[PDB]
Protein backbone atom coordinates (compact mmCIF):
# COMPACT_ATOMS: atom_id res chain seq x y z
CA UNK A 1 0.00 0.00 0.00
CA UNK A 2 1.55 3.37 1.17
CA UNK A 3 3.41 1.04 3.36
CA UNK A 4 4.95 -0.71 0.26
CA UNK A 5 5.62 2.83 -1.02
CA UNK A 6 7.18 3.83 2.24
CA UNK A 7 9.59 0.91 2.28
CA UNK A 8 10.47 1.56 -1.39
CA UNK A 9 11.37 5.15 -0.54
CA UNK A 10 13.46 4.22 2.46
CA UNK A 11 15.35 1.81 0.24
CA UNK A 12 15.84 4.68 -2.22
CA UNK A 13 17.24 6.88 0.47
CA UNK A 14 19.56 4.18 1.84
CA UNK A 15 21.02 3.41 -1.58
CA UNK A 16 21.12 7.03 -2.71
CA UNK A 17 19.40 6.05 -5.97
CA UNK A 18 19.05 8.61 -8.73
CA UNK A 19 15.88 10.02 -9.99
CA UNK A 20 16.00 7.71 -13.02
CA UNK A 21 16.68 4.66 -10.73
CA UNK A 22 13.77 5.70 -8.45
CA UNK A 23 11.40 5.97 -11.44
CA UNK A 24 12.40 2.63 -12.88
CA UNK A 25 11.88 1.06 -9.41
CA UNK A 26 8.49 2.47 -9.15
CA UNK A 27 7.49 1.34 -12.59
CA UNK A 28 8.71 -2.17 -11.90
CA UNK A 29 7.48 -2.66 -8.37
CA UNK A 30 5.70 -5.72 -6.87
CA UNK A 31 2.50 -3.68 -6.76
CA UNK A 32 -0.39 -5.39 -8.60
CA UNK A 33 -1.09 -2.30 -10.76
CA UNK A 34 0.62 -1.66 -14.05
CA UNK A 35 3.43 0.67 -14.75
CA UNK A 36 1.79 3.96 -15.21
CA UNK A 37 1.90 5.23 -18.87
CA UNK A 38 3.02 8.81 -17.81
CA UNK A 39 5.79 7.67 -15.43
CA UNK A 40 6.94 5.54 -18.30
CA UNK A 41 7.06 8.59 -20.57
CA UNK A 42 9.27 10.33 -18.05
CA UNK A 43 11.69 7.31 -18.12
CA UNK A 44 11.63 7.48 -21.97
CA UNK A 45 12.72 11.11 -21.81
CA UNK A 46 15.60 10.21 -19.54
CA UNK A 47 17.04 7.67 -22.01
CA UNK A 48 18.71 10.47 -23.93
CA UNK A 49 21.11 11.28 -21.14
CA UNK A 50 24.15 8.99 -21.04
CA UNK A 51 24.27 8.67 -17.27
CA UNK A 52 20.49 8.09 -16.85
CA UNK A 53 20.51 5.66 -19.82
CA UNK A 54 23.20 3.57 -18.09
CA UNK A 55 21.32 3.67 -14.79
CA UNK A 56 17.99 2.71 -16.41
CA UNK A 57 19.40 -0.25 -18.32
CA UNK A 58 21.27 -1.47 -15.28
CA UNK A 59 18.17 -1.33 -13.04
CA UNK A 60 16.06 -3.06 -15.71
CA UNK A 61 18.68 -5.84 -15.80
CA UNK A 62 18.57 -6.18 -12.06
CA UNK A 63 14.82 -6.44 -12.01
CA UNK A 64 14.84 -8.92 -14.84
CA UNK A 65 17.03 -11.20 -12.67
CA UNK A 66 14.61 -11.51 -9.85
CA UNK A 67 12.90 -14.79 -8.90
CA UNK A 68 9.92 -16.48 -7.37
CA UNK A 69 7.54 -14.38 -5.46
CA UNK A 70 9.10 -11.21 -7.00
CA UNK A 71 7.91 -12.37 -10.53
CA UNK A 72 6.11 -9.01 -11.05
CA UNK A 73 9.57 -7.33 -10.96
CA UNK A 74 10.49 -9.40 -14.05
CA UNK A 75 7.20 -9.06 -15.88
CA UNK A 76 7.02 -5.30 -15.32
CA UNK A 77 10.71 -4.86 -16.31
CA UNK A 78 9.75 -6.52 -19.67
CA UNK A 79 6.76 -4.24 -20.05
CA UNK A 80 8.95 -1.20 -19.36
CA UNK A 81 11.54 -2.43 -21.87
CA UNK A 82 8.91 -2.90 -24.59
CA UNK A 83 7.74 0.64 -23.95
CA UNK A 84 11.28 2.14 -24.02
CA UNK A 85 12.02 0.18 -27.07
CA UNK A 86 9.10 1.71 -28.94
CA UNK A 87 9.16 5.21 -27.54
CA UNK A 88 12.49 6.26 -26.03
CA UNK A 89 15.90 6.85 -27.53
CA UNK A 90 16.64 4.29 -30.23
CA UNK A 91 19.74 3.29 -28.21
CA UNK A 92 17.51 1.20 -25.90
CA UNK A 93 16.47 -1.17 -28.71
CA UNK A 94 20.08 -1.43 -29.93
CA UNK A 95 21.21 -2.60 -26.52
CA UNK A 96 18.30 -4.93 -25.97
CA UNK A 97 18.93 -6.59 -29.40
CA UNK A 98 22.51 -7.23 -28.38
CA UNK A 99 21.35 -8.89 -25.10
CA UNK A 100 18.54 -10.98 -26.52
CA UNK A 101 20.08 -14.22 -25.17
CA UNK A 102 19.28 -12.97 -21.64
CA UNK A 103 15.58 -12.27 -22.33
CA UNK A 104 15.48 -15.66 -24.12
CA UNK A 105 16.40 -17.45 -20.85
CA UNK A 106 13.20 -16.10 -19.26
CA UNK A 107 11.28 -18.60 -21.42
CA UNK A 108 12.07 -21.10 -18.72
CA UNK A 109 11.15 -18.88 -15.64
CA UNK A 110 9.01 -20.83 -13.18
CA UNK A 111 6.93 -19.86 -10.16
CA UNK A 112 3.94 -21.48 -8.50
CA UNK A 113 2.60 -19.59 -5.54
CA UNK A 114 1.26 -21.09 -2.34
CA UNK A 115 -2.36 -21.36 -3.68
CA UNK A 116 -0.84 -23.56 -6.38
CA UNK A 117 -1.42 -20.91 -9.14
CA UNK A 118 1.22 -20.74 -11.84
CA UNK A 119 2.30 -17.04 -11.87
CA UNK A 120 5.54 -17.79 -13.78
CA UNK A 121 3.70 -18.53 -17.04
CA UNK A 122 3.07 -14.71 -17.19
CA UNK A 123 6.84 -14.20 -17.45
CA UNK A 124 7.24 -16.95 -20.07
CA UNK A 125 4.41 -15.48 -22.16
CA UNK A 126 5.80 -11.95 -22.07
CA UNK A 127 9.42 -13.09 -22.64
CA UNK A 128 8.40 -14.92 -25.86
CA UNK A 129 6.69 -11.80 -27.10
CA UNK A 130 9.57 -9.48 -26.22
CA UNK A 131 12.07 -11.80 -28.01
CA UNK A 132 9.67 -11.80 -31.07
CA UNK A 133 9.65 -8.02 -30.91
CA UNK A 134 13.51 -7.75 -30.81
CA UNK A 135 14.13 -10.27 -33.58
CA UNK A 136 12.13 -8.36 -36.11
CA UNK A 137 13.77 -5.16 -37.50
CA UNK A 138 10.85 -4.27 -39.67
CA UNK A 139 8.35 -4.55 -36.86
CA UNK A 140 10.74 -2.47 -34.59
CA UNK A 141 10.72 0.26 -37.22
CA UNK A 142 6.99 0.09 -37.75
CA UNK A 143 6.34 0.32 -33.94
CA UNK A 144 8.65 3.36 -33.54
CA UNK A 145 6.86 5.15 -36.43
CA UNK A 146 3.44 4.37 -34.94
CA UNK A 147 4.63 5.78 -31.58
CA UNK A 148 5.70 8.99 -33.29
CA UNK A 149 2.45 9.12 -35.27
CA UNK A 150 0.64 8.97 -31.86
CA UNK A 151 2.73 11.73 -30.38
CA UNK A 152 2.17 13.88 -33.47
CA UNK A 153 -1.65 13.51 -33.26
CA UNK A 154 -1.64 14.33 -29.50
CA UNK A 155 0.27 17.56 -30.31
CA UNK A 156 -1.78 19.01 -33.20
CA UNK A 157 -4.72 18.45 -30.78
CA UNK A 158 -3.36 20.33 -27.75
O1 LIG B 1 9.21 -7.93 1.98
P1 LIG B 1 10.42 -8.51 1.52
O2 LIG B 1 10.47 -9.99 1.62
O3 LIG B 1 11.59 -7.84 2.04
O4 LIG B 1 10.59 -8.41 -0.12
C1 LIG B 1 10.41 -7.03 -0.64
C2 LIG B 1 8.97 -6.73 -1.05
O5 LIG B 1 8.37 -7.68 -1.96
C3 LIG B 1 8.86 -5.33 -1.63
O6 LIG B 1 7.48 -5.13 -1.94
C4 LIG B 1 9.81 -5.18 -2.78
O7 LIG B 1 9.85 -3.84 -3.21
P2 LIG B 1 8.85 -3.07 -4.21
O8 LIG B 1 7.57 -2.86 -3.50
O9 LIG B 1 9.66 -1.94 -4.56
O10 LIG B 1 8.58 -4.04 -5.42
C5 LIG B 1 11.22 -5.55 -2.46
O11 LIG B 1 11.95 -5.54 -3.71
P3 LIG B 1 13.38 -4.96 -3.96
O12 LIG B 1 14.37 -5.73 -3.09
O13 LIG B 1 13.94 -5.38 -5.29
O14 LIG B 1 13.38 -3.46 -3.83
C6 LIG B 1 11.44 -6.92 -1.73
O15 LIG B 1 12.80 -7.22 -1.35
From Swiss-Prot:
Tissue expression: Ubiquitously expressed. Detected in liver, spleen and testis, and weakly in lung and thymus (at protein level).
- All residue ranges annotated as the ENTH domain in the record: 12-144
Localization annotation: Cytoplasm; Cell membrane; Nucleus; Membrane, Clathrin-coated pit
- Stated consequence of mutating residue 8 to A: Strongly reduces lipid binding
The consequence of residue 72 to A is:
Abolishes ZNF145 binding
Q: Which residues cross the membrane?
A: none
In the record, the effect of residue 76 to A is given as: Strongly reduces lipid binding
Query: Where do the annotations place a 1,2-diacyl-sn-glycero-3-phospho-(1D-myo-inositol-4,5-bisphosphate) binding?
Result: 8, 11, 25, 30, 63, 73
Q: Tell me what PTMs the record reports for this protein.
A: Ubiquitinated.
Q: Which domain of life is it from?
A: Eukaryota
Q: What is known of its domains?
A: The NPF repeat domain is involved in EPS15 binding. The DPW repeat domain is involved in AP2A2 and clathrin binding.
Q: What task does this protein carry out?
A: Binds to membranes enriched in phosphatidylinositol 4,5-bisphosphate (PtdIns(4,5)P2). Modifies membrane curvature and facilitates the formation of clathrin-coated invaginations. Regulates receptor-mediated endocytosis.
Q: How does it assemble?
A: Monomer. Binds ITSN1. Binds clathrin, ZBTB16/ZNF145, AP2A1 and AP2A2. Binds ubiquitinated proteins. Interacts with RALBP1 in a complex also containing NUMB and TFAP2A during interphase and mitosis. Interacts with AP2B1. Interacts with UBQLN2. Interacts with REPS2; the interaction is direct. Interacts with EPS15; the interaction is direct. Interacts with ENTREP1.
State the similarity comment.
Answer: Belongs to the epsin family.
**What is this protein called in UniProt?**
Epsin-1
Lineage of the species this protein comes from: Eukaryota, Metazoa, Chordata, Craniata, Vertebrata
